[PDB]
């Protein structure tokens with residue numbers, strides 16, 4: 093309708109992170125949920141006075157549900173979608189889309205057949221400062237992008253096989269895909285794994301070659317020592333102030349975009365443009381609803397049939413990059429992208 | 431003597447940058463100079479009431495000169511040293527040492543034969559904060575270095591074959607060589623060249639593999655838009671406060687050193703240690719004499735026969751890395767190092 097009857101599949105962390113968006117946004121009503129855990133079902137049914145179910149089989153059979161936000165573990169993503177599609181439901185699934193490229197192909201096909209929209213869940217490439225930055229790149233005001241440099245140093249690895257590559261490199265790659273705006277053509281990466289305790293790849297650095305000359309360097313460190321939010325005006329990833337409650341925009345650490353005539357540096361509270369004149373802080377409005385840019389995508393895809401940017405085909409390319417990384421670090425070698 | 435009779439070959443920029451050190455440091459007396467340009471000679475002779483000369487042939491023949499700070503263009507470095515050595519003078523030559531590896535080999539040999547010290551001039555790897563950081567790594571307090579991430583965004587390219595690689599990547603490589611402390615084994619680099627006006631390689635990003643696992647990412651951008659000193663407590667490269675008074679230490683932009691149990695972040699005014707419990711800012715003393723760490727190296731090499739760290743064999747390895755970079759960017763393949 094005017095308002096959008098939304099069903100949630102998977103009632104954990106992704107869900108709770110997404111939760112204050114869903115309430116606050118006038119265009120969204122939560123109408124139904126599913127989870128295997130009944131205490132979650134008990135939970136949801138109570139707060140929302142709404143039907144709950146064991147499987148997605150339940151939620152997708154409910155005629156009152158217009159689209160399903162799939163917010164469960166990665167390995168269920170593909171199957172869950174294939175079903176929601178079967179029953180004519182729009183899908184918003186969380187990063188990563190899926191673990192495999194095949195999975196992705198199927199997901200996009202199952203959705204194309206059922207003729208329903210497929211969007212990928214809060215990616216940080218949705219955040220206003222970045223979208224605002226891409227606008228500046230779009231305008232051609234600073235000429236084209238030549239070099240992107242992005243870092244993030246977080247406590248993720250200690251927040252209470254790939255791990256950081258698939259969850260965290262995704263956000264990072266998606267922002268750089270967003271901002272450069274051309275295709276990724278080659279990737280070269282090093283992962284670090286140096287805590288026995290938490291024996292996963294906890295940091296990386298990578299080089300990306302882009303179509304038409306631009307290149308990018310991405311570095312992630314998750315071992316929770318240095319906190320890169322110091323260089324983002326002491327605003328946390330979810331918009332809250334960490335400085336030593338009207339939140340700010342979301343981000344994924346320090347990014348610098350170098351274009352021919354200038355440097356763009358998006359912030360949670362503004363976008364700085366370093367130019368031929370000099371410094372410009374063009375400030376941003378305090379987001380009224382957190383992560384509302386995700387809803388707009390969904391809302392306008394379903395109500396007004398507008399191609400969403402962050403569709404299944406986009407997400408698939410980011411994943412492609414994620415795999416290429418882990419292959420580069422995995423072997424000794426570069427990975428060209430066909 | 432107690433004091434050190436020093437002769438200067440080449441009286442331009444490097445010289446003037448080094449000049450307030452030379453005056454202020456009690457252990458150094460300027461006694462002689464040479465330059466081809468007589469207005470420079472006129473200049474030096476007047477301020478310092480001292481003998482000046484056309485060639486280094488002159489300065490090296492002066493019996494009163496104990497060592498020569500060679501601060502001329504790169505292509506003269508080798509020859510000038512060969513001579514100063516021939517005449518038994520110690521050499522402090524400016525980055526880069528030389529242009530070629532052969533040149534380097536000869537320089538070190540000419541100096542080993544004449545049995546005189548050879549040190550490479552103000553490298554930023556001399557700066558207190560970095561030396562202090564290496565101390566922390568030395569102590570083993572944080573376990574070994576795993577990943578180094580270093581960036582610098584400057585106005586160098588517009589300050590009134592590959593210019594930034596040899597001048598600027600040198601400082602950067604030297605700091606990372608300093609701090610990791612093991613051998614560089616492989617390099618992969620991308621340079622950008624995007625101003626027709628100033629058609630040089632003005633930016634790069636690189637991956638460095640080190641002996642025994644650690645890796646590093648270095649990024650330089652010289653096109654003078656964004657200023658990375660924002661993230662160094664708004665203190666300039668030569669210690670002056672940018673912001674909105676005795677100087678502070680020298681630096682070369684934001685560096686983060688990740689060791690197994692924590693992250694070290696050197697600053698011009700302190701060294702931050704992030705580890706278990708909290709932030710630690712261990713502060714530093716305001717340098718009494720700018721770049722005094724260069725003099726100590728020289729002074730202790732000549733008076734007290736202490737092996738200098740930044741010797742000709744060190745500088746040669748940095749240059750080796752610098753060449754490897756320009757080869758990687760040049761060919762788009764990796765470069766292993768022997």
Ligand SMILES: NC(=O)c1ccc[n+]([C@@H]2O[C@H](COP(=O)([O-])OP(=O)(O)OC[C@H]3O[C@@H](n4cnc5c(N)ncnc54)[C@H](O)[C@@H]3O)[C@@H](O)[C@H]2O)c1
Pocket residue numbers: 101102103104105106107109126127128129147148163164165166168186187188213214215
């Ligand atoms: N971009 C973001 O904001 C963000 C946040 C965190 C994680 N994520 C994504 O969200 C996903 C889920 O959130 P989370 O894992 O952080 O929290 P979580 O593991 O606590 O929540 C997921 C829950 O979904 C339930 N679930 C629903 N349908 C299921 C099914 N068919 N099979 C099994 N379990 C099912 C499970 O009970 C599980 O506990 C992650 O796998 C990841 O893809 C992205």
Ligand SMILES: NC(=O)c1ccc[n+]([C@@H]2O[C@H](COP(=O)([O-])OP(=O)(O)OC[C@H]3O[C@@H](n4cnc5c(N)ncnc54)[C@H](O)[C@@H]3O)[C@@H](O)[C@H]2O)c1
Pocket residue numbers: 439440441442443444445447464465466467470485486501502503504506524525526551552553
């Ligand atoms: N780390 C640092 O502080 C720093 C600073 C700037 C540049 N550098 C190094 O300093 C070197 C020289 O300083 P600069 O180039 O910035 O200033 P510059 O070019 O104005 O000064 C060098 C001067 O040396 C004189 N000279 C002396 N002997 C000479 C000879 N035999 N042939 C020709 N000229 C001779 C020339 O007159 C020349 O002008 C550079 O090549 C570079 O290696 C490093």
